[PDB]
C-alpha cells in the first residue's frame, strides 16, 4: 500500500476558510482509509446520511468531495437537508437528498483570541436564496435610499458582510466550530476510490 488520499490536508489545515467563500476539494485516484479520521477523538457531530457510518471501506466510489467551512457552534444544526436559517439561505446549503457524512469539532483553542478574531465573515442578506452547492462572493453595496452610495457604506447603504466576534470568553454557543462534509458519488466512469487491502 503506497498511494493514499490526502485527508490530513482537509482535516488538519493551519486555518480554514470563511463560510461564505468556502472550499471544495475533489479526491480521486487514490486509496482512502477512514481509520485516520479518528485523530480528532472528541467529534462533536458525526451525522451520516444514506451510508453506514462505519463500513465506509466497503464500497468503491468514482470520486468524493470534501466541503469545509467555519461557523458558530450555535448553527451546526443548519447543516442538514431541508433546513432553513441564516446560513442555509445565504451562505451554504445542502441538497434535499444527501449521501455521505458530516463531521464537526470545536476549535475554541485555535481560532478565538484575545482582542477578538476578525478573520471569519458571513453574509447578512441577498435578494434570492442560495442554491445547493452554489457559491457567491460578490460584495456590492445595496442602495435602499434615494441617493447613491458610490462605493461608500452609510445610512441606507449597507455592506453585506459581518465578521464573527470570536474571543476566548464566550459560551458553548458563539464559539468557533469546524465542519467537513463528505459526499460519496459513483457515475458511469470506473470507480477509483476505496479502501486498502
Amino acid at each position: 500500500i503506497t498511494n493514499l488520499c490526502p485527508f490530513d490536508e482537509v482535516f488538519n489545515a493551519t486555518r480554514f476558510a470563511s463560510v461564505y467563500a468556502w472550499n471544495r476539494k475533489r479526491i480521486s485516484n487514490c486509496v482512502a482509509d477512514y481509520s485516520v479520521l479518528y485523530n480528532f477523538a472528541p467529534f462533536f457531530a458525526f451525522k451520516c446520511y444514506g451510508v453506514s457510518p462505519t463500513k465506509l471501506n466497503d464500497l468503491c466510489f468514482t470520486n468524493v468531495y470534501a466541503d469545509s467551512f467555519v461557523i458558530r457552534g450555535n448553527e451546526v444544526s443548519q447543516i442538514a437537508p431541508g433546513q432553513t436559517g441564516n446560513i442555509a439561505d445565504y451562505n451554504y446549503k445542502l441538497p434535499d437528498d444527501f449521501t455521505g457524512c458530516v463531521i464537526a469539532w470545536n476549535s475554541n483553542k485555535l481560532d478565538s483570541k484575545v482582542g477578538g478574531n476578525y478573520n471569519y465573515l458571513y453574509r447578512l442578506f441577498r435578494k434570492s436564496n442560495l442554491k445547493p452547492f452554489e457559491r457567491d462572493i460578490s460584495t456590492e453595496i445595496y442602495q435602499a435610499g434615494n441617493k447613491p452610495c458610490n462605493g461608500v457604506a452609510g445610512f441606507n447603504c449597507y455592506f453585506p458582510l459581518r465578521s464573527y466576534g470570536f474571543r476566548p470568553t464566550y459560551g458553548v454557543g458563539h464559539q468557533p466550530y469546524r465542519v467537513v462534509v463528505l459526499s460519496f458519488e459513483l457515475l458511469h466512469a470506473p470507480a477509483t476510490v476505496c479502501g486498502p487491502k
Partner: antibody, heavy 122, light 108 residues
Framework: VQLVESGGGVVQPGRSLRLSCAAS????????MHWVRQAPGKGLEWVAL????????YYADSVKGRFTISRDNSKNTLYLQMNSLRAEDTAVYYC????????????????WGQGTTVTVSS | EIVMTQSPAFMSATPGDKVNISCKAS??????MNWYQQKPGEAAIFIIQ???TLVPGISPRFSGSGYGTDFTLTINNIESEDAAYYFC?????????FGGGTKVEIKR
C-alpha cells in the same frame, strides 16, 4: 426617511378600527415592519411583526386572534386591523422599521414614528 | 419571555459629571441589545447598536459596555439638551421585550 401614522381615535368597547402607517424616501418593499404600543404610565410593549414579503407574521400572546397585520407595497402602506377592542387597548401605537433589508432573521428596529392615540371608552 | 430591568427609573443630572444606566437581563443574550433615546413629543432616536457599537452621526460622548446579562450606558460631559427618555431593548428571541424607563433632568 419618514414614517407617519394615522387613523387613531375614540371607539366604543367591542368595536373595530384600522390604523395605517405610511413610509417614504426609501424602498418599503424590502424591509420588515414592527407594530409597538405603550400604555399610559407603563413601559413599551411589542405587538406585531411582518416580513418584507408578507408570508411571515408574528403576534404577541395578549393580542392573538384579534389583531391583523398587513401591508401594501404598491401604495407603500402598513395596516393594522383591531377587532373586539377591550379596556386595556388604550395606548400609543408606534410603527417601526427593521434595520436591515432583505433579511428574515434580525428583528432589529432603527426608525420609529410619531405615533397615534387610541381610546377605548363609551 | 426575558424580563429586562432598567435602573434607575429617575435621576438628577448636574451640568457636568458622568452618568451610568444599568440594564439587566434574566437570561444570557450575548450582545443582542440596542439603546434608544426619545425626547418628549418627537420620535425615538437610534443611539447604540449591539451594546458596543456607536451609531454614526451621534455625539461621541455616549458610550456602551457589557456582555452577558449586565449592560451599562455611560453619558459623559452632560449638557442641557441631554434630558430625554432612555430605554434598552433586546431582540434575541420572541417575544421582544423592552426595558423599563429612565428620565434625566438637569440640576440647578
Amino acid at each position: 426617511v419618514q414614517l407617519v401614522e394615522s387613523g387613531g381615535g375614540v371607539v366604543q368597547p367591542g368595536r373595530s378600527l384600522r390604523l395605517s402607517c405610511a413610509a417614504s424616501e426609501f424602498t418599503f418593499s424590502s424591509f420588515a415592519m414592527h407594530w409597538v404600543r405603550q400604555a399610559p404610565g407603563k413601559g413599551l410593549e411589542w405587538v406585531a411583526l411582518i416580513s418584507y414579503d408578507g408570508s411571515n407574521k408574528y403576534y404577541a400572546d395578549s393580542v392573538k386572534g384579534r389583531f391583523t397585520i398587513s401591508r401594501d407595497n404598491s401604495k407603500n402602506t402598513l395596516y393594522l386591523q383591531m377587532n373586539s377592542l377591550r379596556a386595556e387597548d388604550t395606548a400609543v401605537y408606534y410603527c417601526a422599521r427593521v434595520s436591515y433589508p432583505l433579511t428574515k432573521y434580525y428583528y432589529g428596529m432603527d426608525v420609529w414614528g410619531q405615533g397615534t392615540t387610541v381610546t377605548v371608552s363609551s | 419571555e426575558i424580563v429586562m430591568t432598567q435602573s434607575p427609573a429617575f435621576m438628577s443630572a448636574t451640568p457636568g459629571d458622568k452618568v451610568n444606566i444599568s440594564c439587566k437581563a434574566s437570561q444570557d443574550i450575548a450582545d443582542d441589545m440596542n439603546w434608544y433615546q426619545q425626547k418628549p413629543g418627537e420620535a425615538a432616536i437610534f443611539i447604540i447598536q449591539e451594546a458596543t457599537t456607536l451609531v454614526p452621526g451621534i455625539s461621541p460622548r455616549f458610550s456602551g459596555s457589557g456582555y452577558g446579562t449586565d449592560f451599562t450606558l455611560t453619558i459623559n460631559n452632560i449638557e442641557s439638551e441631554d434630558a430625554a427618555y432612555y430605554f434598552c431593548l433586546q431582540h434575541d428571541n420572541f417575544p421582544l421585550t423592552f426595558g423599563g424607563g429612565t428620565k434625566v433632568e438637569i440640576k440647578r
